Structures are given as C-alpha cells and as structure tokens.
Amino acid sequence: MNGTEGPNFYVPFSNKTGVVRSPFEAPQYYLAEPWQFSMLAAYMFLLIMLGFPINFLTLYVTVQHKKLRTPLNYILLNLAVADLFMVFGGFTTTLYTSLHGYFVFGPTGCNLEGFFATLGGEIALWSLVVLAIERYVVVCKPRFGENHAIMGVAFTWVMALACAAPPLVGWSRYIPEGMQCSCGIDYYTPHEETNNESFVIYMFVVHFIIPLIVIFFCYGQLVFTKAEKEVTRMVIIMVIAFLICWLPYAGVAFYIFTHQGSDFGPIFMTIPAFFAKTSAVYNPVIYIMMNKQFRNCMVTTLC
Template identity: 25%
Template sequence: MDPLYTTTDDPNDSMENISSNFTDSYNNQFVQPVWQVVVWAIAYCSIVIVSVVGNIVVIWIILAHKRMRTVTNYFLVNLAFAEASMAAFNTVINFVYSVHNEWYFGLGYCRFHNFFPIAAVFASIYSMTAIALDRYMAIIHPLQQRLSSAETKLVIGVIWVLALLLAFPQYFYSTTAELPGRIVCYIDWPEYKIWDFKLTYQICVTVLIYILPLVIMGVAYLVVGLSLWASEIPGDCTDRYREQLTAKRKVVKMMIVVVCTFALCWLPYHVYFLLHMFHPDLLEERFIQQVYLAIMWLAMSSTMYNPMIYCLLNDRFRAGFKQAFYWCPFVPEGSYKSLELKTTRYLQTQISMYRVSRMDTTVSTVLPFGTPDDTTEPAREEEPGCLRHTAVDLSPNGSTRDTHSKTTPPPSPTTTWTSED
C-alpha cells in the first residue's frame, strides 16, 4: 500500500523534489496532538486483536472438525488466513508510518509492507468469488460435478500465485530514502515517455481486486437469490426439502453480507487513491491526514468483521466460538455437539425402503439431500422443487423397468439414513 504524503508518497517525484517538499512545505504540519495519536492507536490495535483472534478461531473451527472441511469452508480458511495475516503484519505498521511519516523498519520490511497487502486482498476477495461460483454451481447446476478437496486446495494455490504476481511490482520498486532528519519508504515507479506505468498499474489493481470480482459475485448471487427466493415452495414437498432450502438461503445470505461488508469497507480506499492519481494536490491539505487515517482504518477493519458475521448468522460457527471462549464468564454455555454434522458432502444414493410382494420386487431409492445444516454441501443438490422418488421394478424375467413419481412418500418406519465421511 502506498504511503500517505507527497514527501514520501508520490513515487513520480524525484528525491530532490521530495527533499524540497520536506524542507519548504512540510515543516511538521502533520504532527498530531498526543490525544489524537492515542485514540487512533487504540482504534488500530483493536482491529489487530479482534481480527487475529477471530480469524484464528474460524480456522480452528474448520480444521479441527473433520466434517466442517467442505468446499465453502476451505475457502473460508483461506479468507481467514489472508485477513489475519494482513491485520497482524500491516495494520499497526501502516498506522505508525501514517502518524509519524517516518520509516523505522528497514528496506526489507518496506518491500513487504507495500507488497503483502495487495496479495492478501487479492486472495481474500477471490476466495469470496470462488465461494460465490461454488454456490452458483451447487444451486443452479446441481447435477454438475463439484470440486473435490484436492481441487479446492489447487484453486487456493492458484489464487495465491496470481496474488503474488499481481503484487510483485510493488515489491520490486519499493525502496527507502534518507531525507533531512528521517527515512521514508516509498515506491520508485519507473518513468516512461510513452505511458504512465504507475497509473496503469493502479487502475489494473483496482479493477482486478475490487471491480471485477464484485461484478462476478453480484451476478452469481443475483441469479442464486432469484432461484432460492423468487420461486414458491410446492405444497407437497417434504419437511426435509424445506429444511435444505432454508439452509441454502442461510449460507447465501451470510456470504452476501460478507461481500457487501468487504465492498463498503474498501470503497473509500480505492476512491481515495484514484483521486490521488488525478489530483495529487489533495495530499498537501492539512486535513488529509485525518481523512487517510479514517479511510485506512475502515479498509483494515474489513479483516475483523467476517468472524462476527459467521458467529451471528451460522449455528455451527456460533457453537465453535462458544466452545473456544467457554472460559469467559459472559459467554453462554452452548451445545458443542452442534458442530458435528449429520451428513457430509459426498453422499451416495442409499436404498431406503424394501417392499416385497408376491408378484414382483420393488426397490425404492431415495436420493437424500445433504444435511440441513448450512455449512455442508451435498455432492448433488436438486434445483428448487421436490425430492424425486425413483422406483426400479424387478420383473420375474430379470428385466428392469424405471418408474418415476414427482413426490416422495413418507419413509416407512424401517427407513434408515446413513452417510459416509
């Protein structure tokens, strides 16, 4: 992330111009009263504590419970890791540099400081995009094959490779310089007569880590929302189908809240830097420091909201947080057993009823939906509608005849539901 002021911030300026700006116009104009520094320090440190603790608990809830390891939750692990890392390694450093306008941490960390946030934000938002596309495929195209565990990990690896490649220019061109009385960390962008490399890069970053993924997620969730909420539930559907539809709505609603929160938190940041690109004189205004600190706080705070959203909108995560903080006196006792899912993602067709008659034998196969819980995904999810009942009639001569009915009769008392891990 670029630093704040023209004296350190404008990589298009030469070091002579930077030094001149420092001696002629800076004159400690951005020095804040102690009470303001304390208030901002508390605000930024609260982000680090809440984000790191909350996201580590999210990772523990998913990885420590085998049946929580679903496609959606693997991407949530990646999202939590990226957000916790950015909060731990960049938030406080960014605050210190913004307040003092002096770099204390050396060239190596200067490069990391400008490099890692871009990669982390890219990994975060494309993890959300992957979840949106996975939900789209599960609900709109339920018969298509879903991602396996290995394929999901491969997608996460590709996301991080692309993130590192996108952020690499910020690492490569980052450097430090010594000004009168202080050291600054800035990005020394190359200057070409043909094109403005810095402007092109900043626009590409804004499109790739904000505009494009938000458009993709917006379209995906719009289609999914119309499918889940616009159609009426048929009156002859089973209770299990209604529970499954409710579960789908819950997880989609939770992810829409996550995406909207991210978009709102990062919108002022991208607007600020685009304005800076076209109106660099704004950075010379005295009030800009407070504006920048507020915008940066809002952007960094996006790393701490997701664990709260999971806890509020998801029963499984709520149970996990209660288990993690059971020692706190104000945390109500919860049911840890609710973390144990009834079924897992990979469900095979189970033979549920056997009816034997004198004339022929009919084996009725019920295709169960996945667990009604909102943190698992069945291997095959039906489109809105009722469960189908498939009957295979075995005639005495060994031939088979398929019959289908649109509704599923209630299972007999001998029906058993099984699942495989």
C-alpha cells in the same frame, strides 16, 4: 502540485514554508498533532489484540472438527490464515509507525505494511469470487466439492500475489499515504522508472472490476432465475461487508490517481486507509453470527 514529492514519497502538504520532512526520516508532526497519531496507534493495537485471537480461534476450531469441510469452511479457513498474515506481517509495522509518527523502519517497513494489507484484501476479494461461483453452481445447478474448494483456495493466493507482489520488485511501488503511517500503491506520482500508470490500471481492471463483474453476474443468476439458504445468506453479507470496507479506499485512490497533484490534505486518505484495515477481523465475526454449525463447534471447543 499542492504536495511535496520526494524520491520515494509524496507528502500531501506543501513545502512552501520549508517544514516538510521525509516520512522515512522524522516524525510527521508538522501535518498532524501528536494526539492524532496516538489515535491511529490505539486503533491498530485494538485491531491486533482482537484480530489475533478471533482469527486463530477460527483456524483452530476448523482444523479440530472434521465435519467442517464444506467449501464455505475452507474459504473461511483461508481468510483466517490471510488475516493472521495481515496482523503479524503488516499491522505490527502500522502500530510501530503510528507510535513514532513516521516509518522508523524505512522503506522496508512501508513495503511490509502495504504488501500484507494488499495481499489480505485481495485474498478476500478473490475468495468472494470463488464463493459466488460455488453458490451459482449449487443453487442454479448449471458438483462443487472439496477438490474445487481447495483449488479455489490456491487460486486466491495466486491472484492476490499477482496484485501485491509486483510493487515489491519494480512495477509500481508502495508509498506512504495520508498522515504517512500506512503504505499503499503509488496513485500519486507518474514515476516512469516503475511504470506506475500501467500498474494502477492493471490493478483496478484485473483486481477490482473483473472480480465484481463475476460476483454480480453470479448473483444476477441467483436472483433473476435451509442449509444451503444459510450459506447463501452469509455470502450476501460477506459481499456487502467487503464493499463497505474497501469502496471508500478504492474511490479515494481512484480520485487521487485521476487528480494527481491536486489540493488534498493528509486526513483525506488516512480515514479510508485505516478503516479498510478492519478487513483483518470482520469475516470471522460474520461467520459466527451467520453459521449455526460453526458457532456450535466454536462453543464446543471453547467450553
């Protein structure tokens, strides 16, 4: 083992020189210089200051205009709400933690940070499953209305909770990653008390592989068989954007899980874990660029 395991942490830094301290107890300046922590904090402050207004405006515009009741409108409303939970529930702790160089709030802070990021990301992935099914139904006509869209929304919360909630209550756990200023699922230790290995397999199979199978089956039907075209084009970009956002994180996580205790440093997981937090802001940006009706309503409300 090239790192330092504690009761509730795994620091990717050897304690041969005795300098490692718990990320719930002291600033982690032995593994990165203070200016690097400041860069994480500046980045998180930007995400909060952009993420709050752009997601609140999306929610507000949608509620104000009764014309905006297609399945796409409902799903983007759901994403805006989930993004606001990410921003206020999790990113406020990421910011405070990055400012101080460690989880001042202790494991409770780590739980907040990990839970709301996992919940928000999985709401997005299962939302794409709903949109992929909706596009397949509408285009391939094997009708998907408001009732199905709302049932789709409720479905995304249930699936996301089934992924994000168990590590709060004893199946796996949230644990600091990288420079120790964000938390994720424990890919790092066997920790039999929380049955870590089975949760990670469950997460990658049920909450990553199975959704992508559905999405690409639906896409394969679309391909290998103006208003609707605009929606289909937007969903294509939402799926591409999702993979850009989360595949680096998913790949590094899976590497760690299959290479536990190997020689990797703090920057290895820091970059993908923080890049993935752009998930709280990018979907409304795509929405504005690629949906004429929503863009016009937004300009109408804002002006």
